[PDB]
Structure formats: C-alpha cells, structure tokens
C-alpha cells in the first residue's frame, strides 16, 4: 500500500543531511522546499542515490514502478509546501518533480531497452536528432459558463481530449435547462513541451545493422537543453502510447545530461586554479602546449606551433562597418605517410565544437547547407551542413585534393565572409557559419617532385590558395639519421604504448581544453608604433615573390595574416597589447612554412 509510503518519503525529505555543502550538516531538500514555496524555483531533482543511502528498499520499488511514486512525491511536496511558507489540486501546482537516476543502474543502449522494462526507470545514451521547438501543452483546461457566471476545470492526460458542453453544475441546469460554456486560454494552464528523437551511436551497432530510434517527450524544465546532432544521456520512464494489442512506445524524459566530452558536460566547469596559473605564468607556456599536442607523433615541432594558433584564433575587427574575420585557416600539403590524418584526428577531439569530413565522401551541398523535401508534407526545409554544425569551432577536411571541383568552390564563401547565402526554391537566407577550416592534401600525384616548380605540383587556383593563411608544406625526406630517430620513436611506442619520456610531460586533454577556453577571451590591441615594422616586412614579401621563380601568389590578403597571426600569440602570453616580439614569431612561421623546399 501507498498511504504509509507518503510518510516514509516525507521523513526522508525533512531529515536528510549532507556534508559536501562546504559547511556543516545542512538540509539538501530543506532549503529546496523553502525556495519552491517562495516561487523562486520550478524543478526539484530528487536524487535517488540519497534515498539509497538510508533506505535501499524504497529505491527497489521506485525503479520498479516509478509512475505511482512520481505522484506520491508530488503529493508529499504539495502538502509540505504550505507548512513551510482553486478547486482542483493541480491547477495550483506551479512546480514539478524529476528523478535523477540512481547510481547503481547502468546506462543501457537504445537497442537494449526491451518490453521487460515498460514502466520502469531506465537510462539511455544516444545522439539527438530532429529536436522540435517549444510549444504550449495544456494541463488544466478552464471553461466558463457565461450564463450562470461560473468557472469549471478539467485535467488532461492523453495526447488528445474531448472538450465539454455541459456546464454540469446542477444549479444552472436545474433553473433553466439550457446553457453553453466557452473554453478559455486565460484561466487554463499550459506547460512547455518539445519532442525529440534519439538514435544509436553508429559505433555501437552490429557490423552492418541499421540503427534504431526512440522518441523523447521533453517537457517542463528540461526543454532547450539539447541541440540536434549531439551526444546526450537521458533518464526517464519508458511507456506505451495511448489509443490491437501491439503498442508504440516513447521515453518520457526526467533528466537530460550532455556527454559531449565523453564523460559529462564540463565546459561550464572550466575553472583554472592558482596551481595552474603557476604553469600559465611560466616563461614558455606557449611552448609547453605546442609539445603537448598529439605527443604520439615524433618531430613536427613547428606544425604543432601553428595548430595551436588555429585553436586560439586571432581577433576580429569592425571599423566603419567593414568586417574582418578573426579565424585562421591552415593546409598541410605534404608527402604520403607523414601523419597528417593523425594530426587532424587529434585536433578534432581537442575542440569543443568540431566536425570531421572527407573530401571524397562529401558533396558540396552537404558541407554548406541543403534544401530537402518532406514526402509527408511536400514542404521544403533547410538542413545545415558540416560548416554550419561547426559554427564556433573547427572543421577538418582531409583528402582535400580529391574533392570534386564543383564541390570545392562552395567553400570560398565560408572562408572570407563566413556566411552561407542560400537562394534555392524554398528558402532565401544567410546562415552564420563562423568556422575555421583545417585541411590536408597530397601535392601533385602523391609525391612532390623537384622538376616542376610550385603551383604545378600543388594545383590550387590562386583564388583558393590565398584563402589559407598558412599552406604548410611537409616532405618525407629520407635522411638516414632522421629515419633512425623516427623508428626508435615508433618502436618505443609499440613496446610501451606511450611516448618516450619527453622534457615536459604533456598536459591532459581535459586540462588543455580549459587552458585554451580561458585564453580565448582577451582581445588584445595593436600599438601604433609597430605599423612601421609590420609594413616593411610585408613590403619585403611583395619583393621576393615578385623577384623569384617558384614563389606562390601573394596579395594584400597576406598582411592580414601577419596581423591576425600575431594577435594569437599575444593572446597566449596573456598580454593585452601586441608586442614586437610576437610579430617576429609570426614572420618566422610564414617563413618556416616553405623552407622544406630548400
């Protein structure tokens, strides 16, 4: 029976201690109930590990039913609220209660949840898809009899409901045997609501099987948490749909947690301590990170110095209404087997918002944005591509010389103005795609050769070559010595499954992903006294590439490299003004990128 459970839950809600509050033993739910009584809060995430601390039996009979109990709890709190501080007892609820999963249960997959767990508290993991938009869902419909001057209500449970035409008040009927009553959207009560689908990770699927979906009815306070195309973990009851004996089922979410980082959304917990400010304040903080990027890869001391600037990014201006981008694009032309598709796979995992794409397996409308029809409605809708889903992050395109030539000019727009302007036959708009691109490619026919000059063993039209601030050029130079050290590195790796002890142990990925997010928001400036130095450098470049027989196409878009490739450095050193020592680092980079040919 349940009448005695409504007391065994009130006990727990009024008695529970907790020490980690940083103070003494306070009441985790004692403060919560007051806040809820003062209408400063809406949801009450009753954890289940805390009930499983003094009563591991109640937890057994919650995850067994979890549908009655989620109502006993919302009655217990309904009674306790007045004791701290209309007709139906649900129109005046103005709060909701959600179960936060018990720690002993294990997160299933979508394929595992079978019929033997209908009506129980489950936990699934997946990728979001097709999240809807918030719409008001009714809970308590309020009607009025305009004739007899009254008010009536009715509560809703199903996804449908039939209204009333009675005015069942026996007085109004008895006096006159006549009268209709109107619906009304003022006295009623709505609640936010949105439905979203989940799919399995295509990784955890049998070798060639089709992924299965599930439906999630987010509502109340969990709305607007999850974005489409996202890794998420959901906790909620698993029920069948109302209205022969077969049944279609949906997951009724009680708790939604983002697990992008492979552990749990810890982006908001990006707090740097003083013991880490120790490191960040060291003389060569810029040089530790550079060595701690993909440590499994020997050599390439300079490429890792630029792949960090790409992750930090310069600053972006707006004078007299003339936007200048503040991202950096980088290409990695080089011989086969130099670990480029390793560097890219690493820079994919070290970025909050990232995307991975292959040139030969992606079409030009699938990068930017595509207009697609719905055979259920005949209506054309937009669907973002790769560069849209990677808005404030990094996109990675390896096998970049093999992408079809009509599917490659769809990037010229995203690399300069950083919008996507669609004018197909359903839509006319400009999406925002502020992504910074990183691509890899093989030079001419697999291998660089010294007969033909540049620009003919690269094969990029100048209009696209100039979009890249740094077209880095590596080689597979077979220097006997350079090969011996490379081999003695890789064999160590295959022995110990680790890299050989370096001068400074690499920082964890979790920690760098925070060191950088703290290092983005500085916005340094430029000092006037430097405009004479910078200038001369640029001028000198326009001389060399004009008085040479190999050099690439340099243009007035190169100056903004020097400028935006130095506000990155000055952003690492945590300065708030660019100094003459970073301009020379930038200038060295733009020179150490084509020396691999001399």
Partner 1 sequence: MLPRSPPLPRGNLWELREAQRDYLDFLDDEEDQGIYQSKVRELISDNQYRLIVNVNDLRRKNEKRANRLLNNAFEELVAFQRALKDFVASIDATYAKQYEEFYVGLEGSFGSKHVSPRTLTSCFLSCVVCVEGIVTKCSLVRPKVVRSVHYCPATKKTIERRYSDLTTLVAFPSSSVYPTKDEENNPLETEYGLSVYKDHQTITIQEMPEKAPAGQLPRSVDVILDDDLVDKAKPGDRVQVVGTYRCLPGKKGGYTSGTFRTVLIACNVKQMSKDAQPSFSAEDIAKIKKFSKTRSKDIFDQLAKSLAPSIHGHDYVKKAILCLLLGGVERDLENGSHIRGDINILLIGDPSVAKSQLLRYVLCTAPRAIPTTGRGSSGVGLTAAVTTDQETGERRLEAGAMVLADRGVVCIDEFDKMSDMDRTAIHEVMEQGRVTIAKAGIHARLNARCSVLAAANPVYGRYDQYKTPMENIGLQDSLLSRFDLLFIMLDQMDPEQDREISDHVLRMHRYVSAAFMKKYIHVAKIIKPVLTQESATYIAEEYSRLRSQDSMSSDTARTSPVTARTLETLIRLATAHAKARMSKTVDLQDAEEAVELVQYAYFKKVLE
Partner 2 sequence: DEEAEQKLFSEKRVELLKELSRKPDIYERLASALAPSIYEHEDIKKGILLQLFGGTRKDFSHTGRGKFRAEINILLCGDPGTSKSQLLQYVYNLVPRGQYTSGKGSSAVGLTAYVMKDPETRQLVLQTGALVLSDNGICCIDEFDKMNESTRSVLHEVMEQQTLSIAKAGIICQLNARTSVLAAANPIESQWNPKKTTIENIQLPHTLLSRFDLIFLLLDPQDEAYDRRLAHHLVALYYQLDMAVLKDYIAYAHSTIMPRLSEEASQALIEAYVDMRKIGSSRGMVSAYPRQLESLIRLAEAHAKVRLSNKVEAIDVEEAKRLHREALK
Task: Could you list the residues known to form a binding site for ATP, using ranges.
Answer: 298, 337, 339-341, 442, 467, 557
Give the number of other CB atoms < 10 A from CB of residue 36. Answer: 22
Smaller CB separation from partner 2, 497 or 529: 529
Q: How far is CA 129 from CA 126, 200, 230, 580, in A?
A: 10, 11, 8, 49
Torsions phi, psi for 474 (to 5 deg)? -100, 170
First to last CA, the chain: 86
How far apart (Å, rounded) are the C-alpha atoms in residues 386 and 398?
A: 14
The distance of Cα 123 from the centroid of its chain, to the nearest Å, equals 21
Q: Which does 526 bind (CB under 5 to 8 A by kind): Zn ion, partner 1, partner 2, none?
A: partner 2
Q: Please report, in range form, the residues annotated as the binding site.
A: 298, 337, 339-341, 442, 467, 557
DSSP 476: -
List contacts with partner 2 (CB under 8 A): 317, 319-322, 324, 364, 377-379, 406, 409-410, 412-413, 416-417, 421, 423-425, 428, 461-463, 466, 525-526, 528, 531, 534-535, 538-539, 542-543, 546, 553-557, 559-560, 563
Query: Least Å distance between CB 540 and partner 2?
Result: 10
Bridge pairing between strands 137-144 and 182-191: antiparallel
Site string (145-164) toward Zn ion, x via CB under 5 A: x--x----------------
What is the nearest approach in angstroms of partner 1 to the Cβ of residue 168? 14
Rounded Cα distance, 219 and 252, in Å: 9
In terms of CB distance, is 314 or 384 closer to partner 1? 384
Nearer to Zn ion, 152 or 292 (CB): 152
Residue 345 touches which member of partner 2, partner 1, Zn ion, none, C-beta under 5-8 Å by kind: partner 1
CB of 235 to partner 1, least distance (A): 16
Alpha-carbon span 108 to 345, nearest angstrom: 28
CA distance linking residue 367 with residue 487, whole number of Å: 38
- Looking at the Cβ atoms of 298 and 538, the one nearer to partner 2 is 538
* Residues 140, 512: Cα–Cα separation, whole Å: 50
Residue 57, SS3?
coil
Min dist. Cβ of residue 91 to Zn ion (A): 19
**Nearer CB in complex with partner 1: 40/203:** 203
In angstroms, the CA 73 to CA 68 distance is 9
Question: Which residue, 77, 80, 73, 84, is CA-closest to 48?
Answer: 73
| Contact partner, 148, from Zn ion, partner 1, partner 2, none, Cβ < 5-8 Å per class | Zn ion
**Of 339 and 541, CB closest to partner 2:** 541
Chain residues 165-184 in contact with Zn ion, contact rule CB under 5 A: 167, 172, 179
Question: Shortest gap between Cβ of 550 and partner 1 (angstroms)?
Answer: 23
Residue 203 interface partner, choices partner 1, Zn ion, partner 2, none, CB cut-off 5-8 Å depending on type: partner 1
Best CA proximity match to 286, nearest among 269, 268, 302, 270: 302
Can you give the binding site for Zn ion, defined by CB under 5 A?
Answer: 145, 148, 167, 172, 179
């Amino acid at each position: 029976d349940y009448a005695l459970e409504k007391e065994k839950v009130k006990k727990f809600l009024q008695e529970f201690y907790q020490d980690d509050e940083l103070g003494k033993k306070q009441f985790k739910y004692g403060n919560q109930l007051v806040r809820l009584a003062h209408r400063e809060q809406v949801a009450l995430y009753v954890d289940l590990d805390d009930v499983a601390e003094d009563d591991p039996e109640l937890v057994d009979s919650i995850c067994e039913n979890a549908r009655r109990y989620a109502k006993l709890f919302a009655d217990a709190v309904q009674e306790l609220l007045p004791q701290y501080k209309q007709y139906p007892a649900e129109l005046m609820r103005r709060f909701e209660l959600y179960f936060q999963g018990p720690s002993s249960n294990k997160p299933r997959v979508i394929r595992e949840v079978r019929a033997d767990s209908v009506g129980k508290l489950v936990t699934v993991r997946g990728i979001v898809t097709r999240v809807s938009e918030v719409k008001p869902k009714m809970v308590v419909a309020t009607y009025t009899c305009d004739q007899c001057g009254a008010e009536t209500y009715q509560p809703i449970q199903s996804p449908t409901f039939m209204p009333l035409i009675m005015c069942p008040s026996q007085e109004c009927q008895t006096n006159r045997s006549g009268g209709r009553l109107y619906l009304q959207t003022r006295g009623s009560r709505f609640i936010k609501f949105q439905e979203m689908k989940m799919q399995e990770h295509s990784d955890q699927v049998p070798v060639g099987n089709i992924p299965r979906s599930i439906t999630v009815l987010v509502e109340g306070e969990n709305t607007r948490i999850a974005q489409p195309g996202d890794h998420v973990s959901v906790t909620g009851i698993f029920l069948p749909i109302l209205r022969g004996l077969l049944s279609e089922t949906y997951l009724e979410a009680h708790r939604i947690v983002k697990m992008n980082k492979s552990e749990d959304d810890e982006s908001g917990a990006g707090e740097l301590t003083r013991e880490e400010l120790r490191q960040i304040a060291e003389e060569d903080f810029y040089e530790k990170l550079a060595a701690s990027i993909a440590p499994e890869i020997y050599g390439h001391e300079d490429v890792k110095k630029a792949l960090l600037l790409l992750l930090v990014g310069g600053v972006d201006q707006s004078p007299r209404g003339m936007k200048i981008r503040g991202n950096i694009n980088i290409c990695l032309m080089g011989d086969p087997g130099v670990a480029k598709s390793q560097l890219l796979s690493y820079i994919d995992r070290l970025a909050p918002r990232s995307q991975y794409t292959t040139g030969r397996g992606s079409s030009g409308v699938g990068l930017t944005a595509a207009v697609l029809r719905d055979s259920v409605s005949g209506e054309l809708t937009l669907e973002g591509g790769a560069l849209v889903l990677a808005d404030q992050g990094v996109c990675c395109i390896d096998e970049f010389d093999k992408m079809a030539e009509a599917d490659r000019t769809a990037i010229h727009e995203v690399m300069e103005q950083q919008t996507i302007s669609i004018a197909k036959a359903g839509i006319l708009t400009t999406l925002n795609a502020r992504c910074s691109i990183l691509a890899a490619a093989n030079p001419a026919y697999g291998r660089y050769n010294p007969r033909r000059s540049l620009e003919q063993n690269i094969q990029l039209p100048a209009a696209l070559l100039s979009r890249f601030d740094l077209l880095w050029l590596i080689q597979d130079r077979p220097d006997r010595d350079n090969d011996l050290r490379l081999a003695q590195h890789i064999t160590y790796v295959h022995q110990h499954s680790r890299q050989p002890p370096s001068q400074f142990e690499p920082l964890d990925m979790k920690l760098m992903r925070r060191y950088i997010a703290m290092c983005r928001e500085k916005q340094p400036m430029v000092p006037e006294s430097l405009a004479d130095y910078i200038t001369a450098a640029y001028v000198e470049m326009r001389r060399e590439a004009w008085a040479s027989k190999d050099a690439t196409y340099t243009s007035a878009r190169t100056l903004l490299a020097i400028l935006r490739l130095s506000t990155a450095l000055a952003r690492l050193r945590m300065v708030d003004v660019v100094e003459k020592e970073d301009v020379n680092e930038a200038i060295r980079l733009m020179e150490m990128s084509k020396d691999s040919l001399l």
